[PDB]
Structure 1
Amino acid sequence: MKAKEIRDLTTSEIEEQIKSSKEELFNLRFQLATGQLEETARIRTVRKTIARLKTVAREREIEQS
């Protein structure tokens, strides 16, 4: 998910998306550990999604001040 859609989302939606993305990342890591993950690029994709979500959240809580 890109920064444009992230900015479309609302703050509560940003937090929920961060939670679900972190849960997905955890599941991906566990599959990788157990040897059940072939599509390894998903880990990096989700990591960058989380980074973008947090970036937009920080932008909002900065511009509020």
Structure 2
Amino acid sequence: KEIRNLTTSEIEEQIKSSKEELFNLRFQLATGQLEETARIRTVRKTIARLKTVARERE
């Protein structure tokens, strides 16, 4: 999605979005503390884009 960043920044980004944001929101939506639930489907799709462009670079 026009991320156009250094591939190591792509790996830092997949590793940040991959657990931290998404895993935290998955715990919050279970223990009854997350509203703005639509964050989740945002982060998921972000973790797809960072992966696809890295695969395009190969």
Which of the five TM-score ranges fits, normalised by the shorter chain? 0.7 to 0.9
Instruction: Report deviation, 1:9.
Output: 4.3
- 1:21–1:50 CA contact under 8 A, matched in 2: yes
Aligned pair count reads: 58
Q: Percent of aligned positions with the same letter in both sequences? A: 97
TM-score of the superposition, structure 2-length normalised? 0.76
Question: Which structure has greater helix proportion?
Answer: 1
Task: Name stretches of at least 5 consecutive residues in structure 2 with no aligned partner.
Answer: none
Over 4 Å off, 4+ runs: none
Structure whose alpha-carbon radius of gyration is higher:
1
What is the TM-score normalised by the length of structure 1? 0.69
Superposed CA RMSD = 2.2
